[PDB]
Structure 1
Amino acid sequence: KEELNIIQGALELRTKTVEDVMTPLRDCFMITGEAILDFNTMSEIMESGYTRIPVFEGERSNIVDLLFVKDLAFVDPDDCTPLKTITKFYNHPLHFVFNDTKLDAMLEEFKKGKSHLAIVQRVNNEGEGDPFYEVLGIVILEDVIEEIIKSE
């Protein structure tokens, strides 16, 4: 029954990590900061079905901003407005989390906050020199909910 799947999903929030349920970067729907909000761009955005779109610059691992489809409400597609312009105005916060972060805590961070999206990253000491932050993908609240209510 569902009750069992949920409880089991709850217990596993202790062991499991954001890396276990995240959406790997290569599968993430992203957009470039050098984008122009013409009718076409905005069409491709509203068509994706996504509410939150990560904004990258140069590489996909260089997530620099967060686009909400809600931010395109007053954008006129005939102004051919740059995305930089909007992201500068709204400037929604970016939240980063580590790959080893447990799901029970991530959920807790998600609940206190309007943030339901976080960038999963890890530490790459595998240099070649200075260790740095490597982006792995993004995790959203729906990702942990699913690991709770799914059957297993």
Structure 2
Amino acid sequence: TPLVSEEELKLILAGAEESGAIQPQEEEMIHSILELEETPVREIMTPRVEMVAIEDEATLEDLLALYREHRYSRVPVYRESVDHIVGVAYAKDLLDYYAEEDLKGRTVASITHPPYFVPENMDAWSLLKELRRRKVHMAIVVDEFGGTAGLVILEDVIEEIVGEIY
């Protein structure tokens, strides 16, 4: 029956979680749904300085070693520096080769998927939208001058909603 605004609805959420009519964690989830439109990917991304990239001409042995030591399943791919990103590569794709012979035989370029670039200030709501309807759940966050601000994956948006898992 009643009529309410976004601010009033967030207040009723706080007042029905201090009420016990809903769980603290169901509150935090629905609240998180609401804050997605106000979060820029910048606030949730992995920034350039902490990310693990690899060069297109490296070998698939090199990718395997990178997975073993930093444990990141999916890895951006650059040519000259990290500001010239040429695609993305997934460690599980190694399994289709998984031959101590074949791996040193091919370059990461041979398994690199085309890259998805979002501007540094897109909101998590739009990014969830864009990522869900795409086979690559990982976008490159780009700064205002064309450089690589960082990287952002769907599981990060997911965690924003639900919380940390894995």
TM-score (norm 1): 0.80
Q: How much has 1:57 moved relative to structure 2?
A: 1.7
1:83 aligns with 2:107: yes
**CA separation in 2, counterparts of 1:119 and 1:18?**
10
Unaligned runs of 5+ in 1: 125-132
**Larger relative contact order (Cα-Cα within 8 Å, sequence gap ≥ 6):** 1
**How large is the Cα RMSD of the aligned pairs?**
2.0
Higher fraction of strand: 1
Selected match of 1:52 from 44, 61, 74: 74
Runs of 4+ in 1 over 4 A off after TM superposition: none
- 8 Å CA contact 2:53–2:82 kept in 1: the answer is yes
Measured against aligned partners, the alpha-carbon deviations of 1:114-137 in whole angstroms (never above 9, x if no partner) come to: 22100001322xxxxxxxx12100
Q: Which has the higher helix share?
A: 2
What displacement does 1:20 show? 1.0
Select which of 17, 34, 54 maps to 1:11: 34
Partner of 2:93: 71
Are residues 1:115 and 2:139 paired?
A: no
Deviation by residue 1:29-55 (Cα, 9 ceiling, x = unmatched): 1112231233x6523324433221111
The count of corresponding residues between Structure 1 and Structure 2 is 139
Q: Deviations over 1:75-125 (max 9, x none)?
A: 5232422325xx34x44221010112111111011111222100001322x
